[PDB]
Amino acid sequence: IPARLRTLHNLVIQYASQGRYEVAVPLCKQALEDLEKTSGHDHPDVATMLNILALVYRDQNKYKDAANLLNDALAIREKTLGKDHPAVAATLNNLAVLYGKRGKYKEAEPLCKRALEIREKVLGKDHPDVAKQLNNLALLCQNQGKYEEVEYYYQRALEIYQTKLGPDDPNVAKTKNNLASCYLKQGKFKQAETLYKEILTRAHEREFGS
């Protein structure tokens, strides 16, 4: 991300995190206006700026306002960076999240799957950004009740995370809790209780010393 933009990012998110949207929002909109003046609309820095203001709106739960901006950012990024660029998968995942926040889980799912395929096609089927996207897809299938698909995506992500980061990785514990719940939802008690035992024991192990 360009340097003068992330400084603005830090400043605006600081304001947002104090609930001071009356300052965060004008700063983003003016910065967007001034960016457009310098480089015209179809420029990566404009998409980046739109993503910052979409985050601020999301932080206020203005979900449809945020999607409008990211839909604009997505078209910019596809034209300027390409249909398979990682930033396009980033913008697709955020749109999947915003549609899901409006109960529009059937619109969300293609967007999230595309972001997954983009990340596999760039980072390889084993990258942990793929696991992260898998966790995001799993959560969306859960809100549609597709528990066999949830369990598949969580297993894939647990395997990426645990074979590629530590067994003591925050995400490994996070993905194990998610999958454990999903087993219990399905009635697969002995699979659910196998995972729960691991979580407890490893937690006890972490606090205890050598």
DSSP string for residues in 83-103: TT-HHHHHHHHHHHHHHHHTT
Contact of 145 with 127, CB cutoff 8 Å? no
Question: In angstroms, rounded to a whole number, what is the distance separating the alpha carbons of residues 155 and 162?
Answer: 11
DSSP 159-177: HHHHHHS-TT-HHHHHHHH
The CB-based long-range contact list for 200-206 (8 Å cut-off, 24+ gap) reads: 202/167, 202/168, 202/173, 203/173, 206/168
Report the C-alpha dihedral over residues 38, 62, 1, 72, rounded to 10 degrees.
-50
Task: List Cα–Cα distances, 184 to 34, 159, 192, 202, in angstroms.
Answer: 53, 20, 5, 20
**Experimental method for this entry?**
X-ray
Question: In angstroms, rounded to a whole number, what is the distance separating the alpha carbons of residues 26 and 24?
Answer: 6
Structure tokens at 208: 């205890």
Contact of 178 with 151, CB cutoff 8 Å? no
Tell the residue number behind the tokens 């009740």, with chain if given.
Answer: 145
Question: In angstroms, rounded to a whole number, what is the distance separating the alpha carbons of residues 96 and 76?
Answer: 17
Contact of 72 with 112, CB cutoff 8 Å? no
Contact of 158 with 179, CB cutoff 8 Å? yes
Question: In angstroms, rounded to a whole number, what is the distance separating the alpha carbons of residues 142 and 147?
Answer: 6
Contact of 180 with 196, CB cutoff 8 Å? yes
Cβ atoms within 10 Å, residue 101: 16
Question: In angstroms, rounded to a whole number, what is the distance separating the alpha carbons of residues 56 and 69?
Answer: 11
Contact of 24 with 16, CB cutoff 8 Å? yes
Going by C-beta distance under 8 Å and a sequence separation of 6 or more, which residues neighbour residue 15? 21, 23, 24, 27
The CB-based long-range contact list for 162-167 (8 Å cut-off, 24+ gap) reads: 164/126, 164/128, 165/128, 167/202
Nearest partner of 48 among 110, 101, 103, 4, judged by Cα = 4
Length reported for the chain: 210
The CB-based long-range contact list for 179-187 (8 Å cut-off, 24+ gap) reads: 179/151, 179/154, 179/155, 182/138, 182/142, 182/147, 182/150, 182/151, 182/154, 183/151, 185/147, 186/147, 186/148, 186/151
